[PDB]
A paper describes a structure:
Drug efflux pumps play important roles in intrinsic or acquired drug resistance to a wide variety of currently available antimicrobial agents. [name]-[name] is a [name]-based tripartite efflux pump, comprised of the [name], the periplasmic membrane fusion protein [name], and the inner membrane transporter [name], which cycles through three different conformational states during the drug transport process: access (L), binding (T) and extrusion (O). A small peptide, [name], has been identified that modifies the activity of [name]. In this study, we report the near-atomic resolution cryoEM structures of the [name]-[name] pump captured in both resting and drug transport states.
The inhibitor MBX3132 likely binds [name] tightly, since it is active in the nanomolar concentration range, and the compound was used to lock the pump in a more homogeneous conformation. The 3D map for the pump/MBX3132 complex was initially generated without any imposed symmetry and exhibited an apparent 3-fold symmetric pattern. Thus, refinements were performed with 3-fold symmetry, which produced the final 3D reconstruction at ~3.6 Å resolution. Subsets of particles show [name] conformations in LLL (1.4%), LLT (6.2%) and LTT (18.6%) states, respectively, while none of the subunits was identified in an ‘O’ state. Therefore, this inhibitor-bound pump conformation primarily represents a T-saturated state of the [name]. We observed clear density for the inhibitor in a 'hydrophobic trap' site adjacent to the drug binding of the [name] trimer in both the asymmetric and symmetry imposed maps. Comparing the structure of [name] in the crystal or in the apo pump with that in the inhibitor-bound pump assembly reveals that [name] adopts a fully opened state through an iris-like dilation of the periplasmic end. In the presence of inhibitor MBX3132, the [name] trimer is predominantly trapped in the symmetric TTT conformation, possibly because the inhibitor has high affinity to [name] and cannot be transported. Thus, the cryoEM structure suggests that inhibitors like MBX3132 could effectively inhibit [name]-[name] efflux through saturated binding and blocking all sites and prevent [name] from cycling through different states.
Author numbering:
A (entry chain C), B (entry chain F), C (entry chain I): 1 to 428
The structure:
Amino acid sequence: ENLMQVYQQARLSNPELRKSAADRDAAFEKINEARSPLLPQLGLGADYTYSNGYRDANGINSNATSASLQLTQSIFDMSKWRALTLQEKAAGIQDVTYQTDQQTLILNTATAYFNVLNAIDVLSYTQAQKEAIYRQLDQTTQRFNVGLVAITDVQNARAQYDTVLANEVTARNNLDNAVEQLRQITGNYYPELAALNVENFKTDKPQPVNALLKEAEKRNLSLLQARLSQDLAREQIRQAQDGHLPTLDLTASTGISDTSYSGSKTRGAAGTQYDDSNMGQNKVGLSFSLPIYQGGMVNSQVKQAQYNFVGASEQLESAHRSVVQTVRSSFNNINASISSINAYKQAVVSAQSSLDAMEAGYSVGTRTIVDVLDATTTLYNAKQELANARYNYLINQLNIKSALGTLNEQDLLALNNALSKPVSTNPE
Amino acid sequence: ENLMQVYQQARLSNPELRKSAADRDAAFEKINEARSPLLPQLGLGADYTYSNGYRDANGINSNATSASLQLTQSIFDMSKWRALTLQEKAAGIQDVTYQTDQQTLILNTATAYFNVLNAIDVLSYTQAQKEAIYRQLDQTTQRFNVGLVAITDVQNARAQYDTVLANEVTARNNLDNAVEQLRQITGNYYPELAALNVENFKTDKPQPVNALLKEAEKRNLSLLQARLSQDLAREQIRQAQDGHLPTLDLTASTGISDTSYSGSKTRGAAGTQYDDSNMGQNKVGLSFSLPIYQGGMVNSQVKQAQYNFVGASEQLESAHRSVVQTVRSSFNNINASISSINAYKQAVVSAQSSLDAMEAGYSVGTRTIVDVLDATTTLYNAKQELANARYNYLINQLNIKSALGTLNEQDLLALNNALSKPVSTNPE
Amino acid sequence: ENLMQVYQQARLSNPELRKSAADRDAAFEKINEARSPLLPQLGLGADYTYSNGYRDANGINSNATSASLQLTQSIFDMSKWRALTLQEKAAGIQDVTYQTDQQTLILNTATAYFNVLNAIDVLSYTQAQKEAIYRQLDQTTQRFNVGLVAITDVQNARAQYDTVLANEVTARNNLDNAVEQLRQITGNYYPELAALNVENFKTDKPQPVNALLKEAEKRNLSLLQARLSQDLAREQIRQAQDGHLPTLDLTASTGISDTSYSGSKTRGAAGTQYDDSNMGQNKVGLSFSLPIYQGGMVNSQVKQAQYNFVGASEQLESAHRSVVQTVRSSFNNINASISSINAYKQAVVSAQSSLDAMEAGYSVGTRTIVDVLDATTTLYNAKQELANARYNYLINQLNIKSALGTLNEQDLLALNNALSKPVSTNPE
């Protein structure tokens, strides 16, 4: 298919992606965990309880049966507000981790897609080598049947033929592996894939890296997740700062308490005090609590999270020196791959002129049919490493746009505007 | 040694294995952690307490010395029953994580074993190259001492000889590293290792991939650990479903409580109320508690673990597409590596013909002794990449069986039925 | 720059190192977290409370306003003393994890330094190839303009020229990458770097491995972190052994308690019992608690940490066989790399003689100017793989010392006493 229908099946059915989409749904749901202790805590509680004295307290035994309804509320506790702000930012992280995994799918689909078109073409290469080096064997054998070569040059040329098998079988094996790199990323065995339109394919010079990198610092996802990790661990400071701050929570505990006596001291005058006490109480109010001095535990956690922030503030700079290396890598990979194509497109023009010197040289007779088929195979060796350079250009645009972070389904379209007529993956 | 005694020392003495075997013992012991809160909580407590009033409550001060024995019990709490069921499945995971690490030890021993026999033979290769390219040098020197060559053809031939030293030293160094890859996996320096019996070695065609992969899905361990990953996080939903369900526990708190007064209000009529009260109580009964509304914390944890299950459900489909690429990789490696052998088995028959064209060509005199020894080295270049292809076939059987999960000490024996006569590992 | 000023900017500005430097400051600060529950726990609490009876308990309602100051103290709990000892040893681990990252900086500075001087010289190589293979093109063209070659022999030679573009562009791309590998580790673009002084550089024979590995076991940082990992998990046993031990903690809870009635049963005789009870209490004493039987939770955690220790004792043996492999690897890498040098230094002496056979051959006229420049590029091929062997010798000294753990700024000086005169990183 065209690469979009390869990607649009891959977008809906990537298990590497739908896992992260679930964790992006998990982290956004994890905010509702964090905002929930700010919401009330209504819980029912019931008790049966039989006290049993065995001393001076013997004879006073009671079936104190009490049921109660508790409600507590985070009136003022800035840690839960911070843990809300922690969890939003960690969800802001985990949205970016998803935003990587869109582009990671977009990249690795086209990577696995063009590795099929590589291996489709290597299959077209090596069967044109097996039409050649078997033809080399099928005449070095037919020289030995006459007497032109020694038995080495047969048993050599068979070994040069059987190496063609141990390359062409691997070509047929790297075909199915590349298909199963692609089923791994999309979901299905794909019969035909869209080959590259050489007519609508241009060697565009990319944008200058000083404009790329400042665009990368607004968008790139290793950097952006490292920004928000710094934004995460800065609030981890202020969480530990909220152990200094007091904890004011609300008390609301309502419920019955039936307290019925038993035992030997129940036998008595009972003094208008010893009756089957059937009571009920509703305690409303507030619970204030301030940690004054926890042995500097809170100050330790503040001092911990400060170095943990400096530990995280290096992970910005760890990534912020890494994006500069990564952006300049792909920009200096594509500038390689532009000159790589303008080599291997010239290397086609060699092996196209060298082939057509043979076809004219065989039509008049000076070169033989096996110097044709070797030069045919010399042509397809150009046209792999042409196409492989044509794919690694089209990959390294995506390696730019992913390292820019601007990678989407629009840069994918600029690939798929160049993929016009299909070629199959079926070993003939 | 034969591969079994290499493995049987490795099976008993692999720190990569025994750490997992300790963790397989640590995971099954962790089940007894899970079943332990279902068992009682018998704990003895004791208190000394001097109340000190300083207000209207001054004068009522007491050395309240109380010692109490406590017992509680998980009467009804489905989360602990779930945590029992989680931990059995999570140790059901970690049993499979061990079951990988048996086969990982089976494979990586055979990987490190056959990398010795490779590196032994490269050592036998490169000294048959150093017997060759030295005689290449040691005649260009004698051509220069006469005058047949320029000083370039000596200092080239010294450089082509010194490259052979820069390979035969690495062959000796990759020998000792291969021994130390083997000592890393087994435990000892091994003096002689069993070379491959070429007579009882066959190029068997493997079972078809439609039979392999359906046998893989019943057995394969990355998949099986991912199935039980799904089975673990499915119950993590039902753990979070047990925040809905109430918590019924038992109360058994029994013990003395001596209350002996002090202060100014102790001086008085005492009302037959103010004595050194020496008491003791046994509270039996049940503790019921139902979380009604925790701010949707419980529902969020359900909704967390639902999407966390989908992430685990995608990690099955991650691995269930990753088993297919892994199984077809090995099945398309071994189909290559058969043809790789029949390539380099012919490359021996080429080079053994080319060698015997020299030994007959030197015994009559047409080719010289260095054109022999170059073609001798051409023979041993075939007999690496023969034997290396003989090992990579025998490795990729284990890359099948480990990616099938059927790898055991029986597929090991099919390797070791082919390793018959020993060869040393000492550079002569 | 010389390598020290490259390192001394890298020492002060490595975002990988300063991250671990903060984590080294984190774990040492985390000790003060561990010693803090041994320190007192002073916390202020305050309550407002309105009881609301609705039964036989109706009419008794009160504004029980109580404020309380609490202080608790770890009198006797050996787990906190163990968790102090756990944290110090985990800080003993994390100090070693820093000590790796000193050397990991020292190595990867020198590695990324010597990969610039690799790529500088490949840039000096490949322009001498483009000063050669362009002259190969620029006279096959002038053979064709007269008629000595076919159009295949030009369009091949153009393709051999355009491959030299597709290397020399990558040489300039790998130049900027190596500069940005260096900016990634130090912090800046560096204009000139000190090339290797070949005169004061020697091919020293290293220390024997029987002394190295015993000096490694006293010093090496993977192994030392694994020892302290074992030293960590042994105390993890003695933590869970301190669940057996009792928990004696101090009670110091002091504070007011103002209890002012309200309701219908407040109206009454009041019995010198029902007043605005404005009270206050100070509870001093101790809290003793002994877990007798937690369902075998404590024994299981002992039995967990025992098998977890054996896993850690295998992680010693995991690393302790790994260091034996690692130390012998670098020692057998540098023994390779010395013989690599005396290969590629001889390969200079060939390609110096083969060049000087051209300069004496072109000055008299037998060989042409392109056979000069092709043999010049033959020289600069030797001078990469000499210099690369001159760099891999100097790296594999540090791969010894980092896998010894004796790597510091003194072995770095033995590098930098060989880096004398600067060469630049600017493609001319």
